[PDB]
RNA sequence: UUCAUCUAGACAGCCGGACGGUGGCCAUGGAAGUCGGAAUCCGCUAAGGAGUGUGUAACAACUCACCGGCCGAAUGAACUA
């Protein structure tokens, strides 16, 4: 029964002639039910070691998977981004851009300026909502995310910072290609 | 700052567009009786000296020495203004002096009756609001109300004083609170404010904020200073106004304006507010708290100081509270504020109108209202009724908005339930005095126009709480009025002696008359009840009882809850009991009625005086009932018209007339106090099996069936498993969703189970209703306010009966401990008669 | 009003711990056992209540 | 683009939608014609913008199998369970689980019917938990 | 003393994911994994329970199992005296 699952992540060898490598850093389970449908980790790097050939074992460390289809290499290499994660942090999160909000309407009901004003930020109320005056940052480049911040763009105010879905190098049928 | 004249003032309430009808509106301890203070003294009255803390609108000698307001006190006052300034007001004018009418408002929940009372005649609010607290949780139910009738509001933020020494704020977090707060203020508005103004937001550049401590004695607005020091630099107000609230800047060594934050490359600029409105202000605190004497006077003369023969040599602390009142002075910002932005009677009563109306919202009478017309039939409503100074008997006090009002004139009072159809509330009764009102002295005037608050001495031995009077004979009266408290804190009140009885029962009248929703009454359990909106406000009326209006002494009790006898089983076996003359005998038995019908004729849809053969017919098809059984039926009871019933079904039996007279009587003594404790009864029916009646007569009066039946009943009632219904209360609550938790949470400690959870459209404001029973509900309006903060308005009403099962008849059971006591307290034994007695075993 | 980011920081020295049961004292939020011997280090530790 | 919950016959709204500048009136009696064999708890779906009443009828995988049952039934008059379930009538159990937006990641189009197979949770339906490697559509 | 996992990479720690039918059916004024009862099934799967916690009025958003990362060599649990 782990008879059956070293069986199994050995179970599809070779199978193909190109192939694709890749990486998870944040990145939904929802986020690859998507690609699946379009058709067209260590118990793994001595599987090869076993049925020897080839030498691109030295690219795999980190979160990774693996792909496979044999039409045009880059036919595929554009479903690849297709999915654009920009996920809104979870609770609060890290900051890995610079802050900033803009001036205007927001279409939300002026009973969620509770997060507006815990962060200094003037407000006024037109044409029913909360419309926004005299923008400014939260705060520098690489500091705190308050629950006061993140829970206002999060959520409220889809605003986020991309966490995209990544690829690294691939095997053209004997030797390996660096990017695009 | 002098005190003017009686008619005077009279004199201008003709010049109505001068008038400005208005309140004051904050949260318990935020400044507002204080702030009134300071602007009768600039109509004379209180002494610009120590007489700052004396507030005058507190009238009452608790309300004084507790230093809340409890009573919605009010006066009008006479004011200069000059022509500079009476320019920009976006309404009809007329001349530099203008009249205040007002009310100091006291800002406890449980007092919301005084405020909803104090808007219904005023057009205009203004709102206090604490710098450090900000805006807590009245003052958002307190602005619900105003925009509820559609009053416009300004606000002032109040206290800043703490917000310099308590918080040893800069300058620009200190403009970032007014900003955080306006915000919040605002958003309230968007909500609730009548969406046929718009214009109601505020804004500070507007002229619609101001700022300042009242304690300490001065205030201001943007427009204040726009002109002050406009009139130096020689610029202009109105882009200027613009540029010292929010975002835009200066920058001095470049001495041209700015648009965003700018950084001035690198540490950048302060919004005008700071350096130009406020660094005046600071400076004096930081420079006089902490004690730069040297510095003082030529810092003092710097910006303008004045001096006294004693404040000179009076230095920090003491200086701040004596300099900066001269500075800018109280009312100058509030005048500004009030006579420019807030609406004069004509400029409201025209919006008012059509909603304020009971009858159809164009009638002729509303018509001179909207026009604010003095010459119509008067048109006036008693909002609130203020006691006499004399011993209990109460001017009456409202604002009339049609025709005048006189001294002696014959007048028609169109009390809360009037149509101008025939007998109603309508008295027809003369006013002996028109009379306006102050720091409770009033001064009498022969004659009132339209627009204005005024007193009536005269009345309230017609009024009883609120009403409006009118001269047409069919002038209809106007909406009822209703606030966001309901009387829900009860206790019973019984007189300490037992002869001073008179003196409390015309007391509960004065009473009813005192606060506009105090609630007295008598129960079904026989006890005098005074119910009340808080255990606070209950206390007051206490007081107000024990000592004015009763004046006697009287102790306080919960009250005793009314249950009643019933059935759920159809006899664990037959009933029968003999006489003292063991001569005759009855058979029964006792059976409990469907809920459902014995509803049916507490809500009067059959009855005694009425007619079989329909009696029959109704109660047969739909009633899971027969059709001959009722036609037999012989009586009801208790009150010859209670929900316990009486048919025959024996056979050729010997003499049934002639005790017929006797068996209902007997019932009747039996269905108002039965078995287990002798309340009145609802839901069981008794049927009646065989009958051996002697004879000859009179071994068979009426001394011997009732004797036997009343016996003879109580057999055939713990045969068929007693119960009790206890009485459940439907009670709604309007909660935002903030805390829509604390009301689950009560409600089943309290042993509450919802009916409906529903919101209203844009606002949070849930409503949830419940059924509540009342024997788990004492206290409970209280507890309910701790586990939401204040935010949830109970209103509670009676709806049903309900059994338990839990048994009654144990006494370890919560459903026999509640009537184990019930015995005692009523002066009975331990244990219930059981069955074996009043059933003659032969 | 104790901003939120601060809130958390020192509701982590005093909120959030763990104490004994039969000891009383205050431990880390993590531990396993009492490091107090009046009790003799008992594993008996409940979390510290916090509050509303 | 908003979406609502179980409604048999009739429809509380206004908490969303009078804010949202429609006259709710005009749509709660719309939505009696989304929601009418079939009443019973469907889900529903409406996307409007600054005008009238504009809602469909989602694909609520819980309710094709409910009206594929003993449609046969009465609000508060039955009082004990809805167990409704009634014939698994396999066919129309692919019918209506094909129809369902092939979605879930569905590899077969039996891989989608898996899932609602699977609801023995709904009801007998003749038989819980049909066979595994079988013929397909 | 007994039984387990680990170079096919364990234990701790830190990091990424934690799905779809679907708010599953019973009921509930309201119960969407998280008052509760019963069906504890399935699909996409490197994996995700018809859901181990906080939380909501109900959702939310935080959480864990469960799946990978990083580190590379030993660790875990119930017991006895
Ligand atoms: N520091 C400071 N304290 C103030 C200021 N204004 C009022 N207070 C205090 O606040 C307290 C309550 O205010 P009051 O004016 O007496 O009455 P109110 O709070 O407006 O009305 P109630 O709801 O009936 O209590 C007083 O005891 C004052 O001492 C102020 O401007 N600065
Ligand atoms: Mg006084
Ligand atoms: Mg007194
Ligand atoms: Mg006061
Ligand atoms: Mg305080
Ligand atoms: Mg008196
Ligand atoms: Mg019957
Ligand atoms: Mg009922
Ligand atoms: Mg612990
Ligand atoms: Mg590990
Ligand atoms: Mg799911
Ligand atoms: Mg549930
Ligand atoms: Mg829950
Ligand atoms: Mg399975
Ligand atoms: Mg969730
Ligand atoms: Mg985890
Ligand atoms: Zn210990």
């Given at each position: 029964k782990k008879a059956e699952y070293f069986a199994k992540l050995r179970e599809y060898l070779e199978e193909y002639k190109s192939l694709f490598v890749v990486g998870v850093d944040n990145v939904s389970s929802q986020q690859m039910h998507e690609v699946r449908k379009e058709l067209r980790n260590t118990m793994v790097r001595r599987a090869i070691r076993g049925f020897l050939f080839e030498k691109l074992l030295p690219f795999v460390k980190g979160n990774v998977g693996f792909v496979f289809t044999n039409e045009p290499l880059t036919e595929i290499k554009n479903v690849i981004v297709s999915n654009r994660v920009a996920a809104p942090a979870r609770a609060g999160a890290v900051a890995p851009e610079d802050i900033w909000v803009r001036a205007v309407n927001t279409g939300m009901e002026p009973g969620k300026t509770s997060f507006f004003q815990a962060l200094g930020v003037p407000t006024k109320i037109a044409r029913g909502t909360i419309e926004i005056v005299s923008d400014v940052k939260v705060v520098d480049a690489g500091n705190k995310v308050g629950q006061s911040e993140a829970s206002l763009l999060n959520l409220l105010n889809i605003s986020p910072f991309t966490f995209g879905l990544t690829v690294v190098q691939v095997y053209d049928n004997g030797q390996v290609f660096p990017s695009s | 700052m002098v005190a003017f004249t009686v008619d005077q003032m009279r004199s201008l309430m003709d010049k109505v567009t001068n008038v400005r009808n208005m309140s004051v509106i904050a949260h318990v301890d935020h400044g507002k009786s204080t702030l009134t203070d300071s602007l009768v003294q600039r109509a004379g009255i209180i002494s610009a000296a120590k007489a700052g803390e004396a507030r005058f609108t507190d009238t009452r000698k608790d309300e004084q020495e507790r230093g809340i307001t409890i009573k919605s006190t009010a006066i009008s006052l006479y004011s200069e203004m000059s022509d500079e300034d009476v320019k920009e007001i976006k309404q009809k004018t007329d001349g530099n002096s203008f009249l205040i009418n007002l009310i100091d408002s006291p800002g406890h929940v449980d007092f919301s009756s005084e405020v909803t009372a104090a808007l219904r005649v005023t057009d205009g609010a203004l709102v206090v609001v604490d710098t450090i607290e900000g805006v807590c949780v009245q003052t958002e139910t307190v602005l619900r109300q105003a925009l509820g009738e559609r009053i416009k509001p300004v606000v002032v933020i109040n206290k800043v004083d703490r917000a310099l020494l308590e918080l040893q704020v800069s300058k620009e977090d200190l403009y970032q609170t007014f900003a955080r707060t306006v915000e919040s203020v605002n958003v309230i508005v968007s909500t609730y404010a009548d969406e046929v103004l718009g214009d109601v937001q505020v804004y500070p550049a507007r002229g619609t904020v101001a700022f300042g401590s009242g304690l300490h004695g001065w205030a201001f607005t943007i427009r204040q200073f726009a002109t002050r020091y406009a009139k130096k630099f020689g610029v202009d107000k109105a882009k200027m106004m613009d540029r010292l609230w929010g975002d835009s800047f200066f920058n001095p060594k470049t001495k041209k304006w700015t648009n965003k934050d700018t950084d001035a490359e690198g540490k950048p600029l302060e919004r005008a507010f700071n350096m130009f409105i406020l660094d005046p202000i600071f400076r004096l605190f930081t420079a006089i708290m902490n004690f730069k004497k040297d510095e003082i006077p030529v810092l003092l003369e710097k910006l303008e100081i004045v001096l006294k023969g004693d404040e000179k040599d009076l230095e920090g602390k003491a200086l701040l509270k004596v300099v900066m009142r001269k500075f800018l002075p109280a009312a100058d910002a509030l005048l500004e504020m009030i006579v420019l932005h807030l609406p004069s009677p004509v400029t409201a009563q025209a919006y008012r109108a059509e909603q304020l109306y009971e009858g159809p919202a164009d009638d002729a009478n509303c018509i001179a209202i909207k026009n604010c017309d003095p010459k119509a039939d008067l048109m006036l409503y008693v909002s609130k009724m203020v006691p006499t100074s004399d011993k209990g008997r109460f001017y009456a006090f409202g604002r009339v908005f049609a025709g005048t009002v006189k001294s002696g004139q014959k007048v028609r009072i169109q009390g809360p339930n009037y149509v101008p159809g025939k007998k109603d509330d309508l008295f027809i009764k003369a006013i002996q005095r028109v009379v306006l009102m102050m720091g409770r002295f009033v001064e009498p005037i022969d004659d009132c126009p339209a627009g204005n608050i005024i007193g009536l001495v005269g009345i309230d031995q017609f009024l009883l709480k609120t009403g409006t009077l009118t001269t047409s004979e069919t002038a209809h009266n106007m909406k009822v009025m209703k606030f966001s408290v309901s009387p829900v804190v009860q206790v019973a009140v019984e007189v300490k002696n037992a002869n001073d009885l008179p003196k409390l029962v015309e007391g509960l009248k004065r009473l009813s008359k005192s606060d506009p929703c105090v609630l007295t009454y008598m129960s079904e359990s026989g006890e005098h009840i005074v119910a009340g909106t808080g255990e606070l406000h209950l206390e007051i009326c206490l007081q107000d009882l024990e000592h004015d209006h009763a004046g006697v002494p009287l102790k306080i009790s919960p009250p005793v809850v009314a249950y009643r006898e019933t059935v759920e089983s159809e006899s664990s076996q037959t009933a029968l009991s003999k006489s003292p003359n063991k001569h005759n005998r009855i058979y029964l038995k006792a059976e409990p009625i469907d809920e459902e019908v014995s509803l049916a004729i507490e809500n009067?849809?059959?009855?005694?005086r009425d007619d079989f053969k329909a009696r029959a017919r109704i109660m047969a098809d739909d009633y899971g009932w027969d059709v001959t059984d009722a036609r037999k039926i012989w009586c009801f009871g208790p009150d010859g018209n209670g929900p316990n019933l009486v048919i025959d079904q024996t056979k050729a039996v010997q003499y049934l007339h002639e005790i017929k007279d006797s068996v209902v009587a007997a019932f009747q003594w039996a269905t108002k106090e039965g078995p287990i404790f002798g309340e009145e009864m609802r839901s069981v029916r008794v049927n009646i099996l065989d009958v051996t009646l002697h004879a000859d007569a009179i071994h068979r009066g009426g001394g011997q069936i009732i004797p036997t039946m009343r016996r003879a009943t109580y057999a055939g009632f713990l045969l068929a498993d007693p119960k009790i219904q206890e009485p459940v209360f439907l009670v709604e609550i309007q909660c935002p969703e903030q805390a829509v938790g604390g009301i689950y949470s009560v409600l089943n400690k309290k042993r509450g189970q919802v009916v409906s959870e529903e919101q209203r459209p844009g606002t949070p404001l849930f409503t949830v209703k419940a059924y509540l029973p009342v024997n788990e509900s004492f206290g409970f309006t209280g507890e309910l306010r701790q586990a939401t903060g204040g935010q949830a308005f109970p209103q509670m009403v009676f709806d049903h009966w309900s059994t338990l099962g839990s048994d009654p008849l144990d006494p370890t059971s919560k459903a026999g401990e509640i009537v184990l006591a019930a015995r005692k307290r009523h002066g009975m034994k331990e244990e219930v008669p059981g069955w074996q007695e009043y059933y003659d075993k032969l | 009003i104790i901003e939120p980011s601060l809130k958390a920081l020192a509701s982590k020295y005093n909120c959030d711990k763990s104490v004994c049961r039969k000891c009383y004292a205050r431990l880390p939020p993590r531990a396993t056992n009492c490091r107090k011997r009046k009790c003799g280090h008992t594993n008996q530790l409940r979390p510290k209540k916090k509050l509303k | 683009l908003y979406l609502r919950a179980v409604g048999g016959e009739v429809g509380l709204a206004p908490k969303i939608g009078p804010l949202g500048l429609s006259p709710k009136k005009v749509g709660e009696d719309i939505a009696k014609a989304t929601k009418e064999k079939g009443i019973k708890v469907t889900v529903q779906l409406k996307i409007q913008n600054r005008q009238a009443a504009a809602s469909v009828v989602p694909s609520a995988s819980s309710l094709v199998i409910t009206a594929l049952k003993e449609p046969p039934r009465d609000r508060k008059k039955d009082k004990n369970v809805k167990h409704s379930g009634n014939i698994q009538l396999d066919e129309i159990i692919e019918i209506a689980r094909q129809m369902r937006d092939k979605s879930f990641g569905r590899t077969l189009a039996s891989v989608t019917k898996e899932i609602l197979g699977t609801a023995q949770s709904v009801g007998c339906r003749v038989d819980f938990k049909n066979p595994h490697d079988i013929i397909e559509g």
């Open positions: - | 009067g849809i059959i009855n005694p | - | -």
